[PDB]
Design a protein around this nucleic acid. Structure first.
Lengths: 222, 215
RNA sequence: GGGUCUCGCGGAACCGGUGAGUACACCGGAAUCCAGGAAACUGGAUUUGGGCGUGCCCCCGCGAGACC
């Protein structure tokens, strides 16, 4: 059916430029309207711009008037957000959203998964991936816990899977915290049967795209 | 003037099977161009109700919407654990399309005491020059929990951060991680590292500990 | 009384929904007229070109001028 995929977000210095892309499939954007909606981290939803390709019309929120321009390429079936003179208040996840007005009027009936735009003068830095080895004394009731510490990276986000996608049950990947240093650091943990520690290999797969840092870390008992 | 959607309440807690009611007050007559969205944490918002009362295709029937002039109401008739989320009203009567400030719906459930684990720092990290000690509080309810680190019976302050998961979509519990950061130098000065957890479902505080150097 | 371009005048209202991708093909609410009731209405008969965040466009019809 219908899909939207944002791309182009990342780390930009204050005053810098950035060009977002929204790739649409399952429908022709020339017969719809495409919106950008942003969510500053921890806050609510703010519409910034919309475009209607078979009208050419563009509309903008006052907070972005003049710095942002929305555009579309009907042949490529994608929409764009051009951001100039970026500021720290522009830090947010930028969502792409579809609406129709003539055939139906259902609001923003489909949303992409968002791309993160971080406005900072700090630089890209890849994480250190250290193992959290199952305690050698004991654990909770036939079930052991182990994990991975993903430390000192910037900016968000990082991805953590277990066993190249084979292990999802029991995983907690904690939300990042900004350390006092200004770098993020999270842990991903998993509980598993204790009897598996000698039969199953647990590897955490860490991917920090901003710095091209991929670590597959084996987590073994000490 | 930019239409302002005033949403209440800011947050609420309710039990499974309960009726959750969220309201939104349009400042200046959107006619019925009000939509309701569910946003689970870190996911994309999903449309639930459009035109103030039309149940979007695919959404369960326990979600519904009403309009009384400029007063719009989202109702979850029988709250389920997976309905943990933030819900938004929006008007699409005219640009700028404006949203409510959001409502964080938390599921209230029975007390669940945490399972506690302590992780020493890896030898790999020690080489880098720093030591991270991690305590894990796993699958407990409610969220209020107090974690204190002791290093040879000395309590630590100002050298730890916590991170808490979002409420589980199936069992409505939380999980919490506490990370103690020392210098390699300081880490190698002491022997006993202890995590002391206090929480409502624990009759007395639980301590998990290790002695530095346990193969 | 024909064909092509330009200009002018036109092609019920509201609310949904379904296939299509162009500017089309449909299905419902409904409305209109008539009759009846104190009455929300009830019968009977009939009824609107389309696209698209919407003031512009496509198509169709009629008129006028120019060109054959």
């Amino acid at each position: 059916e219908v899909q939207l995929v944002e791309s182009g977000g990342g780390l930009v210095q204050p005053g810098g430029s950035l060009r977002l892309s929204c790739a649409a499939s399952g429908f022709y954007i020339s017969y719809s309207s495409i919106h950008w909606v942003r969510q500053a981290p921890g806050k609510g939803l703010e519409w910034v711009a919309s475009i209607s390709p078979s009208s050419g019309s563009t509309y903008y929120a006052d907070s972005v008037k003049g710095r942002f321009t929305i555009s579309a390429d009907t042949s490529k079936n994608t929409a764009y957000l051009q951001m100039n003179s970026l500021r720290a208040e522009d830090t947010a996840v930028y969502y792409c959203a579809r609406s129709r007005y003539s055939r139906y009027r259902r609001g923003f009936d489909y949303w992409g998964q968002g791309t993160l735009v971080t406005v900072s003068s700090a630089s890209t830095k890849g994480p250190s991936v250290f193992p959290l080895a199952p305690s050698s004394k004991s654990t909770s009731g036939g079930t052991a816990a182990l994990g991975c510490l993903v430390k000192d990276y910037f900016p968000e986000p990082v991805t953590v899977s277990w066993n190249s996608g084979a292990l999802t049950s029991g995983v907690h990947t904690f939300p990042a915290v900004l350390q006092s240093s200004g770098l993020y650091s999270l842990s991903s943990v998993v509980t598993v049967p204790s009897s598996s520690l000698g039969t199953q290999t647990y590897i955490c797969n860490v991917n920090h795209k901003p710095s091209n840092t991929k670590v597959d870390k084996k987590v073994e008992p000490k | 003037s930019d239409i302002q959607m005033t949403q209440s309440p800011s947050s609420l807690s309710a039990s499974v099977g309960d009726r959750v009611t969220i309201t939104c007050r349009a400042s200046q007559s959107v006619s019925s161009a009000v939509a309701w969205y569910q946003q689970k944490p870190g996911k994309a918002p999903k449309l639930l109700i459009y035109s103030a009362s039309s149940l979007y295709s695919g959404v369960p029937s326990r979600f519904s919407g009403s309009r009384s002039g400029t007063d719009f109401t989202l109702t979850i008739s029988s709250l389920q654990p997976e309905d943990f989320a933030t819900y938004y009203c929006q008007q699409y009567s005219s640009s700028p399309y404006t949203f409510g400030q959001g409502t964080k719906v938390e599921i209230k459930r029975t007390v669940a005491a945490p399972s506690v684990f302590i992780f020493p720092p890896s030898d790999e990290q020690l080489k880098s020059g720093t030591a991270s000690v991690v305590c894990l509080l796993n699958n407990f309810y409610p969220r209020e929990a107090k974690v204190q680190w002791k290093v040879d019976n000395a309590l630590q302050s100002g050298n730890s951060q916590e991170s808490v998961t979002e409420q589980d979509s199936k069992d409505s519990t939380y999980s919490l991680s506490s990370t103690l950061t020392l210098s390699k130098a300081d880490y190698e000065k002491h022997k006993v590292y202890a995590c002391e957890v206090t929480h409502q479902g624990l009759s007395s505080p639980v301590t998990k500990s290790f002695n530095r150097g346990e193969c």
